[PDB]
Write a protein that binds this ligand. Structure first.
Ligand SMILES: Cc1ccccc1C1=NC(=S)N=N1
Ligand SMILES: Cc1ccccc1C1=NC(=S)N=N1
Ligand SMILES: Cc1ccccc1C1=NC(=S)N=N1
Ligand SMILES: Cc1ccccc1C1=NC(=S)N=N1
Ligand SMILES: [Zn+2]
Ligand SMILES: [Zn+2]
Ligand SMILES: [Zn+2]
Ligand SMILES: [Zn+2]
Ligand SMILES: [Zn+2]
Ligand SMILES: [Zn+2]
Ligand SMILES: [Zn+2]
Ligand SMILES: [Zn+2]
Lengths: 266, 266, 266, 266
């Protein structure tokens, strides 16, 4: 008769999987991911930090770019995450096995990471990846320091319960550059109202808009560069059109409000 | 330029995914999986036991067959496993969420299950499934009793470090039937000799052939029915051609020796 | 010379460890813990719920009281927690091993439970207990249903990041009784201001006072009965002097404010 | 009436907790634990390895001795274990938090470590310590190499399911020294015969005697130095009276046979 359906792999736009050479953002901060997925390398005197890794199959590419930057596997000290979905935390388990790197995350992100994105609040087991363990649990506003560089966590629950923005201050042209790596504020295919798995979803997103709006934010980056109007393929002008954190939050709220009204109507 | 490859789904023969109605093996023991993947339900006055679940997408089918048998989600007390690969432990995480079932497994199987099959000794992150936790760790030869049915664990390391044969005694026509559910003895695509991730692999397989050969074994069942010459689609003659444990072990060892020789030649 | 210090056991007032017989709170709700530690049994047509277990050594006493109430180990379906410290979650690992029970908790409580209370934000490894795994992760405001009885989670972060109040509606004398089991609002020996491990501690406590104040709350219970003016030894008048949730929140805020001012001065 | 007993702390002989300065064993290998508990530091041009940590409260002492040796927290790459009981794995969780160290262990040791020693086969929740996660799972005979020092795992199940002997080759006076760090072969207060939690306990001990007897073993070291006739307080004659592996194995088996006979008599 009719068999159960085959499992479906998590397939994405080609650009999400398109390798690029390292792109410098500030004196110590580089984009080393793909054209359309962010993975940020911060090189300190005392080892490197990686913020996000992209899709599961990006591990060897990341290590290659790291090597190009003079960062050996042993030199990678810390992995931080925007959120623990397959398209941003995908290669974390493998990176941990192949490098010195330890993971710091909040409790929500740690739990979701530890089950490889299964039992997702909105998509169940539809998009999973290799599970990984967190080495350190961080609280809202807590700082982590590597080679003198201080990273601050700003919780912005919504896209996932554990969604986080990370901020740090680098330099460029002799001046301080307050960098804000803000997580996604999308809700793709989510039930927003009366969601039994996330009863306070709407209130969390609204709080998160306010949080993003107030970040210290000379330069905004996002896990999907298009979200902050970055174009990693545009070389010298990659970041020209980048949004402020204020504009990013406002656009995300407007979009959310639209989705909420369409949900009410449908 | 060329993007990284898309993730590839773990796809299998249609017959592995073909639902079947419950097929009775003995007075308390039923096959409730698919045509070509074993999932054994043992029904007792004191609750039910499931040995293996098959592929990840089989959870709801298994639950329907349990219901057809009179077993509600609350009635399922225990899940046991042959080994913790995606095609036998696939749906375990989901079943734990949807029923009262707890998992008992040996340390090796528990650790691989908790990884959702990632970092496999032989296939790395190639075939993964939703991670699950064990509630009880069992030792070689340890018994678990549910409603008077006594399950004994016989470690048979090789196909996985944690591969296990489960034996118990049921009845049929008022006479005892010693059932042996023996794990796979295959080594599909494995490097057998000088494998740094499994240095004593060959010695473990050889001990496992001996173990399987000696099991109490009026009736042999295997995770893949074809391995023991079962035909779940053959109705009242489903088990007619079934191998003895002795014959299963001898065939597996002969195949294994062939593979070793081929490996040496290649 | 001078050896390192011996490990120090977690010792508590005798009353915390003084067994008591089950004390009925409402038609289906009983106190089955000790004189000075709460452990609530809710008996439904479809199995029992336990809210908290007290100290690690209380497991056998709890099971005894359960048996006295006609609840066999198999009948215990669910364990919920106020917070994952040794004096309330202490026996959870052991109860899981000895019963059918599964644990539901928020991500913060799950993480702290999973490391047996080690690496505590305020007391480090000073007070630990056997670790246990959560079977289900709940979000703020999410409900769980057992035998038709609905339990609602209300996050009240502060005493621990994952501190939770649980509410449900029982009956008594033919009338509905909205029961609120509110977690501790104490901060014993905590650094409140500028705590690097908990930067937003003060803001969370203040939000939690507001949450407790607004609970549906015909009857308030607390993990330490003295906190809500319960006296479990006073038999027929055990709950006579019990505070409202509003009064409990107000007293806790007044105490907090006092501690904050004393911290500023010292 | 009579309250439940207070929790009892895991207290030990003062000499187990007596700090000592680093004692050199061979060119790269140092004892850096206490007088009566082994903790071995292996220093290489490519980072350091720690085998065992001793009791939970020894973390800071170990870190001071590492510093004295020139090993900073970032330099510690790897922790290996004899077995995962409180008196040898005690401080592992804390060391992981405070250094760059990752843990490699076999599945059995990993599972017990992840439980912080709770649900022990023989002592239940009687002696527990802070839980820690393994970063790498090793198989019998698997090698791990750090800075040219090659560590080989030899499973010797018995004292714990996961008990391991670690062997490696160091130098002294320009000649090779084959060091064997053999786990305990004791069974303190164990039920040996017909133990339902460990049905093949005796057969495992006997195989382990044979394994230890055959180790490459110019110098034997043991978690408890007295077991191999080491005297860490004896300076330049600390290792003079040390047993061979052959003699250690024979003494352990003789003791074991005595215990069996006593058990049968009692
Ligand atoms: C990647 C993923 C897995 C499960 C549920 C949601 C998502 C998702 N995250 C983003 S950003 N866009 N889609
Ligand atoms: C399903 C799987 C994942 C990883 C390695 C091996 C296997 C596999 N198990 C069996 S039985 N046939 N192939
Ligand atoms: C029990 C415990 C362990 C660690 C830190 C705090 C506490 C504590 N919880 C309560 S309520 N009173 N003291
Ligand atoms: C420390 C411990 C905990 C539980 C069971 C046994 C032991 C123990 N290990 C050694 S060596 N001597 N006693
Ligand atoms: Zn996402
Ligand atoms: Zn994304
Ligand atoms: Zn397999
Ligand atoms: Zn298979
Ligand atoms: Zn507490
Ligand atoms: Zn308390
Ligand atoms: Zn021990
Ligand atoms: Zn010991």
């Amino acid at each position: 008769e009719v068999p159960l359906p085959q499992l479906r792999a998590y397939t994405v736009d080609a650009s999400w999987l398109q390798p690029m050479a390292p792109l410098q953002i500030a004196d110590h901060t580089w984009q080393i991911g793909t054209e359309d997925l962010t993975a940020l390398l911060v090189q300190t005197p005392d080892g490197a930090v990686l913020l996000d890794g992209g899709m599961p199959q990006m591990a060897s590419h990341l290590l290659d770019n790291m090597k190009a930057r003079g960062v050996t596997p042993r030199d990678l000290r810390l992995i931080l995450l925007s959120h623990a979905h397959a398209d941003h935390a995908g290669p974390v388990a493998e990176l941990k096995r192949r490098t010195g790197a330890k993971v710091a995350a909040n409790a929500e992100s740690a739990v979701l990471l530890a089950r490889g994105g299964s039992d997702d609040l909105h998509f169940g087991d539809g998009i999973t990846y290799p599970p990984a363990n967190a080495d350190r649990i961080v609280m809202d506003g807590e700082v982590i320091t590597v080679g003198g560089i201080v990273f601050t966590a700003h919780f912005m629950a919504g896209h996932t319960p554990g969604s986080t923005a990370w901020t740090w201050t680098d330099t460029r042209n002799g001046k301080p550059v307050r960098i804000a790596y803000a997580d996604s504020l999308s809700a793709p295919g989510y039930q927003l109202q009366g969601n039994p798995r996330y009863p306070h979803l709407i209130e969390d997103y609204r709080r998160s808009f306010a949080t993003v709006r107030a970040l210290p934010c000379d330069v905004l980056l996002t896990p999907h560069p298009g979200a902050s109007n970055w174009d990693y393929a545009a070389g010298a002008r990659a970041g020209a059109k980048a949004l402020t954190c204020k504009a990013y939050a406002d656009a995300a709220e407007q979009k959310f409000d639209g989705q909420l009204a369409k949900e009410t109507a449908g």
